[PDB]
Each structure stands twice: as structure tokens, then as C-alpha cells.
Amino acid sequence: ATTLKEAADGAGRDFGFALDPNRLSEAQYKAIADSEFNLVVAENAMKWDATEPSQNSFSFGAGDRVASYAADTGKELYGHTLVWHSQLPDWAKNLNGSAFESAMVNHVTKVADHFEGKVASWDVVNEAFADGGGRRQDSAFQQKLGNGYIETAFRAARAADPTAKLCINDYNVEGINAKSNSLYDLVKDFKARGVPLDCVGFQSHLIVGQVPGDFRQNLQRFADLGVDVRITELDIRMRTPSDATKLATQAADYKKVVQACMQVTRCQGVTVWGITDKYSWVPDVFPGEGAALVWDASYAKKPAYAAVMEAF
Ligand SMILES: O=C1NCC[C@@H](O[C@@H]2OC[C@@H](O)[C@H](O)[C@H]2O)[C@@H]1O
């Protein structure tokens, strides 16, 4: 194996990255995207704010570019994300009751339909739970619609796209904890009542030297509920600047994650949230933290690269 792509290919799994369409005009970026991955997800192009800036007015330009890139290079296409509390336009946050419900169902239907046949799987609902257990405490959907909005989104997504793999996504649920437990209950419930649900996405936004020791176990119990599992937004945050020691630990961590997936027959694969640290979303969100991706700002393979290659 000379690329992470064929390594993942040989393991019968996916290895993807979060794409910023604008960067495709950057040669080195495209070269890596083209050769090191077999799956692609829109880092931002398919979110609510990007697809429905104004009520009932859709903007699929950016999303279509991402979709075209996938079809053009023969990569699987992953959809992110239909229902999410973040990056939600104000016009939506201003709606309530029936109006809001209607706008949510409409958003799901229009976006799902638009990419039908192209997007193979969707993070239908993202980040619905709260660290420590229970539902997220700062979500427009949870506050305006209560517990039933999740099921409604999945049913509406299934209605718009009969065959797409419908997933629920979250972070800090990689290991067994109060958050993953609540997520687990929801999944068990949905499968029990026949609610459309086919997968669970573990964002996996981890911190170096802090990969959950029960990652595999946790992935396995979810898979045993009768749904596929996948690492969808992998990146391992470290205190900057980076140094040999922290880069080595990070490498060991990436190995652990990919290995956990490899040890679960239902783990479809791993998707890293970006290619290079030059564009990683971490620094601006986590002050003093960064250097979380496989390639550095100069597009040089970091120790994590060889670790992933080995894990696969
Ligand atoms: O599921 C998610 N978990 C947190 C990272 C977020 O992506 C982030 O959203 C904010 C954007 O400014 C940023 O470019 C993007 O990387 C993602 O959609």
C-alpha cells in the first residue's frame, strides 16, 4: 500500500475527508484529496445555513460542487448534515411551533431530494445529546419541538430518500459514558419501533493522549443493535506548537482509532475532518489547540500518516 486510499480499499472500508470545494483550485490540496481518500463529505457546503439561507430559498451551488467532485473522482459521497442546532439561520430560529416543525421537515425533504442518488449516507440529525447525559440544552429543535423532532427528521428523510443510509451523529460518544448511553437508548428504541435509522456516526474530535480505551467495545454494542457505525469527523487536538513527542502520541492515537474500527465488522470506515492543519477548524474554535490532522500546514505527512496506513 502506497496511499491511505488503497490501504482502506484493501480493508473493505472507507477513508474520507471533509472537503472545502474552494480548495480544489489548490493543486497540492487536490492531489492529496484525489489520491489519499475514497470518500468525501462537505465540511460546510451541505449544512442548513449553506443550503437554505432564506426560508424556502435553496442554494445548492456549493453542495453540487462537492457532489460532482465525488462522482468525478469515483469517491463515495457522505451527507452532512440535515438537522443541526449549529449554523442554523436566524429566520429558522425565529419560527416556532407548527411553523418551525414545517420548516424542519421541509428542509430535510428538499435537501435529501436534491442529493438523492448521489449522497449515499446522511447525518440526518447531529449533536442531539448533551455531555453528561440527556438532550442538548441549547438547541432550537429540542427547545421548540421536544424529544420527537429526531424521529420526525428520520421519517421525513426516509420518505424523501428511500435508500440512503440515515445516520445520527455526535461527539464525546466514542467511549461508553452518559452521553453515549443516552444515544444508545435512542438507537435501541428506534430500531425497536421500526423508525428509519441505519447508522451512527462518531465524530471523534479527540484530544491527543486521550483516545477512549473502550472505543471498540462501544462501537461493537452499537453495531449489535443492528446498525452500521462510522468515525465521521476524526481529528486529534493538541496544545500548540507541536513537537516530536506530541506528534508521536498523536500517531499512536490515530492508530488506536482506526484499529477500533477495524475490529468491528460493522464499522464502515473513518473520515478525518480535513486534510491539512493549514485549514483545520480547531485553532479558531479551541484557543491554543490545533495541529490535529494527518498533514501539516506545508502538506507534509505527519507521523499520523504511517500510523493510519498501518492500522488499515
Ligand atoms: O459536526 C460538526 N462538528 C463540529 C465541527 C463542525 O464543522 C465545522 O463547523 C463550523 C465551520 O466554521 C467549520 O469550518 C467546520 O469545520 C461539524 O459540522
Q: Structural domain tally of the chain?
A: 1
Whether 233 lines ligand 1, by a CB cut-off of 6 Å, is yes
- The CB of 17 under 6 Å from ligand 1? The reply is no
For residue 142 and ligand 1, the question of a CB distance below 6 A is answered with no
44 alpha carbon to ligand 1 midpoint, in Å? 7
Q: In ligand 1, which atom is closest to the CA atom of 169?
A: 1
What are the grid coordinates assigned to 180, written together? 453515549
Query: Which residues are annotated as catalytic?
Result: 127, 233
Q: What is the full DSSP assignment across the chain?
A: --SHHHHHHHTT-EEEEEE-GGGGGSHHHHHHHHHH-SEEEESSTTSHHHH-SBTTB---HHHHHHHHHHHHHT-EEEEEEEEESSS--HHHHT--HHHHHHHHHHHHHHHHHHHTTT--EEEEEE--B-TTSSB-SS-HHHHHHGGGHHHHHHHHHHHH-SSSEEEEEESS-SSSSHHHHHHHHHHHHHHHHT-S--EEEE--EEETT---TTHHHHHHHHHTTT-EEEEEEEEEEEESSP-HHHHHHHHHHHHHHHHHHHTSTTEEEEEES-SBTTT-SHHHHSTTEE--SSB-TT-PBPHHHHHHHHH-
234 CA distance to ligand 1 middle (Å): 12
The structure was resolved experimentally with X-ray
Ligand 1 centre to CA of 192 (Å) is 31
277 Cα to the center of ligand 1, angstroms: 14
- What resolution in angstroms does the PDB record give? 2.0
Range of the domain at 200: 1-312
- Pick from 46, 131, 273 the residue to mutate for probing ligand 1's pocket: most ligand atoms within 8 Å of its CB: 273
- For the CA of 280, the nearest atom of ligand 1: 16
Which residue in the block uniquely carries the three cell numbers 423532532? 149
In this structure, what CATH number is given to the domain that contains residue 89? 3.20.20.80
Distance of alpha carbon 132 from alpha carbon 127, whole angstroms: 13
Residue of minimum CA distance from atom 17 in ligand 1: 43
174 Cβ inside 6 Å of ligand 1: no
